[PDB]
Amino acid sequence: TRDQNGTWEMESNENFEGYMKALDIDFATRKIAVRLTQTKVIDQDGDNFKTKTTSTFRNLDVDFTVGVEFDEYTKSLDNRHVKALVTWEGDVLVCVQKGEKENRGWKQWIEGDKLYLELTCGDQVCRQVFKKK
Amino acid sequence: TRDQNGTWEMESNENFEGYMKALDIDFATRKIAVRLTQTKVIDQDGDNFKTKTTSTFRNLDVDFTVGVEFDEYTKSLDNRHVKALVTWEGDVLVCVQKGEKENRGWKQWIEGDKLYLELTCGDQVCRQVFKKK
């Protein structure tokens, strides 16, 4: 069939490394791209094609119980070991990540239809906002 | 509310760069990570949390008509200009990407519930397989 319409989820990707190297893509980018999975959306009308591609990586799950300190290896970021403790301050979920970095942690809370997450390390604050789907 | 259950899609991410730099994450990784959007799935039962996070990047759309040569800037890969021509060979969609690289192109076809995509550059072949969702 010539009908390639649909939403297509990558199951297999062989020698993406060699292909990217042949295209002179830098080592650091190749290290990251080989870990990604793609979803390809094809909208086809006769010989007219529109394709949309998204690349995704799944991070390690983070599971915890409030009030119970746990070991965290921060593989999605700097790959360090921290001892994390999550507590409630009112309706704000507060985490302290004890380790090499000073003032490392995060705070997470709900307002309206949105989730707020503030990440801290040293004097740096990152603010993320998520909408409920 | 302390109930943070749900699927949460990132709408905003401020100073992720400064945070990552504070964590000593390498330049090349930071260049990539600032472009990503996250989906956070929270499964919460009392003070028991399970969180799953996925990071995604959306690539540029690729639109074309079979038989009509078009200009392609390969932003998702090596950022080169090629003149791409897609033709049918039977039910196989064949693209030649004319430019600096020799033997650059791809072939795409359906078999059963799967889409096959073979990418070539020089002597390198990458084979991807997708399942229909």
From Swiss-Prot, chains A, B:
GO terms for cellular component: cytosol; nucleus. All-trans-retinol binds at K40, Q108. Keywords: Cytoplasm, Retinol-binding, Transport, Vitamin A. Higher expression in adult small intestine and to a much lesser extent in fetal kidney. GO terms for biological process: epidermis development; fatty acid transport; vitamin A metabolic process. InterPro entries: Calycin (IPR012674), Fatty_acid-bd (IPR000463), ILBP (IPR031259), Lipocln_cytosolic_FA-bd_dom (IPR000566). It holds the Pfam family Lipocalin. Gene3D superfamilies: 2.40.128.20. The keyword Transport applies. It is found in: Cytoplasm. It comes from the Eukaryota. GO terms for molecular function: fatty acid binding; molecular carrier activity; retinal binding; retinoid binding; retinol binding. The keyword Transport applies. Intracellular transport of retinol. Belongs to the calycin superfamily. Fatty-acid binding protein (FABP) family. PANTHER family: FATTY ACID BINDING PROTEIN. Forms a beta-barrel structure that accommodates hydrophobic ligands in its interior. This is Retinol-binding protein 2. The lineage of its organism: Eukaryota, Metazoa, Chordata, Craniata, Vertebrata.
